[PDB]
Design a protein around this ligand. Sequence first.
Ligand code: ADP
Ligand code: ADP
Ligand code: ADP
Ligand code: ADP
Ligand code: MG
Ligand code: MG
Ligand code: MG
Lengths: 488, 493, 488, 459
Amino acid sequence: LEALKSHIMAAKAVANTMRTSLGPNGLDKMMVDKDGDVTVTNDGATILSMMDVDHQIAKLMVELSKSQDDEIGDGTTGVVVLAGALLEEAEQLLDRGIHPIRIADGYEQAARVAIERLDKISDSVLVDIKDTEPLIQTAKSCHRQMAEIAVNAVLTVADMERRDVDFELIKVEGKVGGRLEDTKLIKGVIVDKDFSHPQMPKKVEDAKIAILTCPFEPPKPKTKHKLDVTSVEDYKALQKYEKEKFEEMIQQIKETGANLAICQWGFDDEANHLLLQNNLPAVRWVGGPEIELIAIATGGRIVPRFSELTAEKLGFAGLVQETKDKMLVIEQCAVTIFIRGGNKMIIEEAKRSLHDALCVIRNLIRDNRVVYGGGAAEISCALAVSQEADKCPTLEQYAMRAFADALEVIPMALSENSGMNPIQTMTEVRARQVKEMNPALGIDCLHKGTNDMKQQHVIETLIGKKQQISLATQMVRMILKIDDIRKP
Amino acid sequence: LEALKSHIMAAKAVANTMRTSLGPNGLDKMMVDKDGDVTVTNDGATILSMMDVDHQIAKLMVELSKSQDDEIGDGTTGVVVLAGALLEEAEQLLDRGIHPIRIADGYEQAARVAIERLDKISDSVLVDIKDTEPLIQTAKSCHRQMAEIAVNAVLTVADMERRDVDFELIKVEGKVGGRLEDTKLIKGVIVDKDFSHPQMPKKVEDAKIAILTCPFEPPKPKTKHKLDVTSVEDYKALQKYEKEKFEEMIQQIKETGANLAICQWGFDDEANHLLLQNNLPAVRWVGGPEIELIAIATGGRIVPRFSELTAEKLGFAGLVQEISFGTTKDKMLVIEQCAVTIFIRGGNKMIIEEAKRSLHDALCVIRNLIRDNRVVYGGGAAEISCALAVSQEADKCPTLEQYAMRAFADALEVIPMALSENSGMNPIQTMTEVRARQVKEMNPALGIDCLHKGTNDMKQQHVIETLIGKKQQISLATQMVRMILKIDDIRKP
Amino acid sequence: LEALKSHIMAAKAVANTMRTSLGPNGLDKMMVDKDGDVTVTNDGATILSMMDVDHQIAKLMVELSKSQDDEIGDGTTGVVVLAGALLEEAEQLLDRGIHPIRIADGYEQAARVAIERLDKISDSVLVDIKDTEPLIQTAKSCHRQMAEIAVNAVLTVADMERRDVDFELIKVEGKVGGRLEDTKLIKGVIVDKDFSHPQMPKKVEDAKIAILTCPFEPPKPKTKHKLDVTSVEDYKALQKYEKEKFEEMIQQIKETGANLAICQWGFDDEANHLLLQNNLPAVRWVGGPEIELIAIATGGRIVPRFSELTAEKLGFAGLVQETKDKMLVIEQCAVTIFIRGGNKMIIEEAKRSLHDALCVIRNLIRDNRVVYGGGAAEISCALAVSQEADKCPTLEQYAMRAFADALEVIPMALSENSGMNPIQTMTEVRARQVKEMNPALGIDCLHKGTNDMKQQHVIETLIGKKQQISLATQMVRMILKIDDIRKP
Amino acid sequence: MGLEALKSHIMAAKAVANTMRTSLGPNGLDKMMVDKDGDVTVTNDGATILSMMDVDHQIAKLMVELSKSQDDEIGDGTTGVVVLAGALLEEAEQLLDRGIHPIRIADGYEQAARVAIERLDKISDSVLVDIKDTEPLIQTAHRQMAEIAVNAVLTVADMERRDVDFELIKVTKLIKGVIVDKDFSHPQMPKKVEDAKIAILTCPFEPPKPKTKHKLDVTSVEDYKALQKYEKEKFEEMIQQIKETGANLAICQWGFDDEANHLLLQNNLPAVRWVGGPEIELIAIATGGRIVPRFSELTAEKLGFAGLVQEISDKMLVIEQAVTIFIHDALCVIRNLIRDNRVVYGGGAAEISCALAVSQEADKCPTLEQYAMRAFADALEVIPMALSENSGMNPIQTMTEVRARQVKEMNPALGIDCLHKGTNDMKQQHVIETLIGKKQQISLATQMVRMILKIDDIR
Ligand SMILES: Nc1ncnc2c1ncn2[C@@H]1O[C@H](COP(=O)(O)OP(=O)(O)O)[C@@H](O)[C@H]1O
Ligand SMILES: Nc1ncnc2c1ncn2[C@@H]1O[C@H](COP(=O)(O)OP(=O)(O)O)[C@@H](O)[C@H]1O
Ligand SMILES: Nc1ncnc2c1ncn2[C@@H]1O[C@H](COP(=O)(O)OP(=O)(O)O)[C@@H](O)[C@H]1O
Ligand SMILES: Nc1ncnc2c1ncn2[C@@H]1O[C@H](COP(=O)(O)OP(=O)(O)O)[C@@H](O)[C@H]1O
Ligand SMILES: [Mg+2]
Ligand SMILES: [Mg+2]
Ligand SMILES: [Mg+2]
């Protein structure tokens, strides 16, 4: 049986590692690590992205933590903290003599209760005309225009009518240099890597693009091959040969519309020369990522060849201009935002913040409902779970109450990270929720305010919490049922 | 003799490992493998499929567990648990002074008794109209459409008139991403991979398929060559040659009907080039399986050549498509000459692999029912009544087989006991009370809830294990115990 | 002197290993072993076939155990058990002060006595019209038709007139799948490996076969060789060359009669193509074993060439047909039986049983005499040996009595394997043989019957026992004389 | 430890049971058994074995005195008690592993014991009393032994009724009372002490040394001879004290020696010396006589009324206020027959019929006690098996065939020959275990197993 307690202990370790980074006052960690740079961040989603590999059960949790929440929802730290708490209680319930399967079934019952109780606390947010602008400022002073950019980005490209699914279709590329919120919103894709030769004309109008992934030397189907190159004459004949078929690539592209092209893999030495004369010149190269962006945005049917391009495909951009990066306007349609800043730390922080923003909006587009955070929704869920537990017989009663006390960890953790007395403030808030009948208040947490939390606008959406609880109960289910730990 | 006790101890060790995974409340076993991912499942069939292969007796239990039950029936974990119990009892019989061959004889006779008793407990199930669907709910809250697609799958592909033996020509593919209720109704066979090339036609309709196991390169003498190209003109002569002989095979396929082709082995550098320019979207590349699927489904008469074919061979498919799931892509085709294949999108990566085994249980169950339509009620009930009959026959038998029969009777009762402990109930208390409620109520159905919700009657909850599942379970268990009870010295050079 | 006791001990070890697998209730062992499959069987003949190599003297026994009995007779387990017993007695006789050479000479005397006494117990079995059918059912419910198949197989192909020697000429090939005794008897050879291409016509009538072992590329007598393949023209000229000489193999075969051929070694890629057009197509390949079967059955003079075939040889089969194996009928003459079953364990068990059958019949054809088994013949032999020992003086007296007590191990072992008290039942049977004067009864052994053993039809033939005793005394002779154990 | 200490006690006790499992029945093994500087003692009958051996585990010592203080002091058969206890524990192990609580197993063993005990009433066979029959009934334990034992226990018995007595017997001739060795010391004394008042004194005979700084100093004749004379007079004090309360002979431990024994002759006080507990408490329980810790301070009262005391070449006393044999086994058996005159046939037969009863009654039982009773049946069946293997027969074979012949022939008698010569009927050979022997055996074994089952932790 102690195999279960080994799993429960190793998982509680991960939880205690992560519960210090919960909330706005969370901590950062270090991570590095492949002789490379460092990353200091809250938001456990990127914390789990590294996390040295040790115990098998811990990695079961690391896989399932990203599995749904980080990939679809937002809140990741909460999943692992809640899971660890549920395990902390399942320990003292296992000691009391209850069988694990009974613990898991009880946690299922309680989970369904809390989820069914998040709908009663829910609040609605409408779409299609701003109003989500003030809903984003919560996701992070500098928020007012960032919200504008976010909504304007997601609403322009979204299924929305109807289906209620986004695309993305959207990444972000920041330039070190500028000042904070001088960031700009665009309508089309933007890439780095310039024209490959300085003498090219900037500004290519109504451009017909040529997306190709091929090398530039004509190959031969593989035979024993070798060569002879006997007389110097044949040497010059060979040079002349591929020098001819370098043009066979140039005007062949120009027959289907030229302007500028786009190449992957290699771009030869004198190729840029022969391409400069014909006003074709492309770019090299940045593969798949940033290639498929231009593929979906304009045209484009990426061509793996090598002389087989016929249009048909490609097109149709209207502007391509600039000190090292080239950016393009007027597309066939596709948005990829742009960010200013300085010191390299003013950017990449706003990228994390933005990520939070886009995620929130997408979730609202799918289902537009919100519950109020700061542990308030957790507390009320615990009230309902405990209430249903008082009316339930047999052993699942105790497992349900354990679920309640486990949910009450989020207010406690939020309190610890801000320096408040955990159980004291947590208890006071639970009391103030029973009376007042206000499932909105709890954990300031910013040390400034009236604690109402309906103010301060702290929203955790709705699918975010239902996915957090569902994933947590799913994990704890596995960990409770895992034994033997085979492995070769 | 102690070699036998070593075998009995190791075998009971395997059994004790998997007696916690018995029933719906069974446990998981982490089970990582090689340099790859992990797999956590109940249903010992996969457990035995990997496990830790060490002792030759454990190897024997894997050998025979997959030999018959996993390949034909369904229940595997029960076989190893029952064999373990029979061994645990036969050990004390060894100590009692009984010869092993006599214990195996008694176990054989008792096994025949129980087997013959399952027929008396049997019940009938109708066929051909919506009657098996509600009885698939035992194999697994997504059941409502799972059972539906199950019966549809096995009834669409079956001998059925009559002979009542059919399997395979049906596979399952999970593409990972969605929720379990996103599972869809199915039509024809569906495979992965791609036609290659992005400029390919992504939807080829009314396709005549050409299935080939051949390389696409023009062959060479394979004598000892030193091919040395002299003049640059001969460089171009080489390129021209293979550029032409790659095409000599293209319109060779197009003269017998083209659309799209199908290739094993290599699809060369240019090749796909020359096939795009000639508008022949072939595909590459897949081994025996998934080749013979499209072979039997449409057409197809797999061609071992290589420029030699007349069609004839090509099949008649109505639609072939390429759909992109997330980033990666799989090409799936509909409207075949007929052959159906199921599809699952579960999400979370672990929500699938559950639906695959749970569905497999469905195909197996329905297949067994078509072969012989009879059911005994599960939850250990059939085991309890079988133990009752075995003890009854044992009280009236003299000499040494008497003791072996009683040991068999007590060994059957481990299934209700394991089912009891895995659900949190007192193992011997509930099992005993049920064994009394089966003689007093004369109802060979009730016993071990086991879901901790219900009337314990087991007539409701409709838990069915068919018949050949149980008959093969007991036959395989007694076969294992028979072999293990013999065998000494374990040479192992 | 203790070198002798080391040999005697190491040999007694092998004996004790084997005496549990004696009789119908014998045990199985495991064997495996080269990262391969397992084999669980009675009949020590296949047990000695593996048996890890340890002591030199043990391997002297393993070589001599197969030397004659398994290769010609049947009973192998009895040889090693009897040898071990003779050694067990030779130990206590060596301690008594008798020289080994005297022990061996006494064992010779006693062996000659017992052998000379097996003729008095002998019984005759006639040949040429069934009657051997009920003689086979003893060799293993399912026996009635198997006996039919066995006699019908051996009598059709045997010298028999006269010479009294078989051939074999006969193997067995079973197909997993079927039901038990649905096995069939044929008149001709049968092989696997199909026609090598599906488009061939099944059923090749009055076929003229072409048995060849050669590769298909024309070689050159070895010189420094190399090549040049300069111009593409010469490349195509080379391809054309061997493409021509591939036909030079085809119609060359068709000139001497074609139908189907048979090839060993490799069969090239496009060779099956060029052979499909000309209605020649052969098979690849399964070497010597199953090749020489068709050689002796039809024709065939296996040709190692490579263009030198002229007929003369080859011929003359009448049918070749079928889901993976091809079988042929109507030959020039040659029998190889066929077996149904299921689970892979229903077959290969009947193969072992069959092996026993064929061996018995062959032995009867050589010399048609039988003694009754179950240890009865052993007991009576012990009675005669002890009787001659009471009238013999000097030291060989004790060695002879030791031979008697050593023969009496077979009834004891047979008793142990069935669970009876060894010395009690053995003694009772010896008594019941002295009175009643019936050298037929002893050791049930099936726990069901009247113990008469003239019933139950338990026959061990005659050469089987005389060879068992001769081989046993031969072994014990060596082991008794071996000393020094040189070795590099 | 908490629980595994239970399995440890099972192992430790069944170790003892397996030690003495070979010494059961007539073909038992003798066990060398020396003792320190002592000699060899080779016998069956574990009764004397349990006295020896060693204190290994406190449960192994708990096996003793439960198998001794009762069955050796009440019944006769000791080895069966420990063998049975070991078997019961062995099956209780399988019941423990099955998930059954220990106290439930102990209770089940109690109820099963009730079934078996109450049977023995049904298997029983009565024997007549008051003459003969008992004599030919003793040849089991060569002719006169029956007679002398019969009349010896006949002379000392309650008989009307309650039927109990022991211990007035110990150790070929007949006997008139209890007898002692040694002499009255100094044969000039009278050998005819008839109508003797015995003065039982376990004490020294010395001048009462005062308590003060002592160190005597003496100079030859004057003081020395006065010292000898002094303690001789002080000896006459005790002499004249014993004659004032009572008369004639006395009995003394410790020292006499010196002249001393001379003086008592001149005063006609033929005492005896010297012996410890035995032969002191023997004549104490026989005649009179209590015990005096003094040393001249007593009232009588105490003295015994022995009628005759004589000396023959060992002095013996007759007619006591008690008869003892002169040259074990049947003497206890007869006592049991005096208590209850019924017998059941032995050789494991009573165990087999009891097992058939406990199992027949166990088939109809709810809850867990079912398995406990069945285990009890399989426990009683170890006596026929052990009996079988000790003679060389196949254990389970002979045992099973007999258990079948008992229900088919309806004969709670036949089973285990065992001497390899007989008709197996057990009616002949006249092998009888009485009733109190078996009933006490089962009660004691079950008491043991229950005790061990309750115990846990225990240091
Ligand atoms: N202004 C705020 N006041 C109180 N709590 C907050 C506030 N903003 C965020 N939180 C809390 O922080 C918790 C976790 O968010 P975060 O630390 O970003 O990690 P994750 O989003 O991965 O859980 C949420 O449960 C939320 O209640
Ligand atoms: N709803 C149920 N109630 C009671 N027992 C069940 C139920 N479903 C399955 N079982 C039991 O589970 C046992 C084994 O099934 P499982 O644990 O899936 O492995 P396997 O099928 O390989 O033996 C069966 O003997 C059956 O009696
Ligand atoms: N039906 C039978 N009853 C009694 N003994 C038998 C019977 N069949 C075979 N045997 C005995 O089995 C012995 C050995 O046969 P087997 O175990 O096959 O090994 P091997 O033939 O190599 O000695 C023979 O000596 C024979 O007496
Ligand atoms: N003649 C006999 N035949 C069969 N069994 C006997 C015979 N005499 C004694 N026994 C058995 O021996 C058993 C034990 O006696 P024993 O070994 O002397 O030691 P104890 O009497 O102390 O147990 C008794 O249970 C009795 O049944
Ligand atoms: Mg957050
Ligand atoms: Mg299952
Ligand atoms: Mg044989």
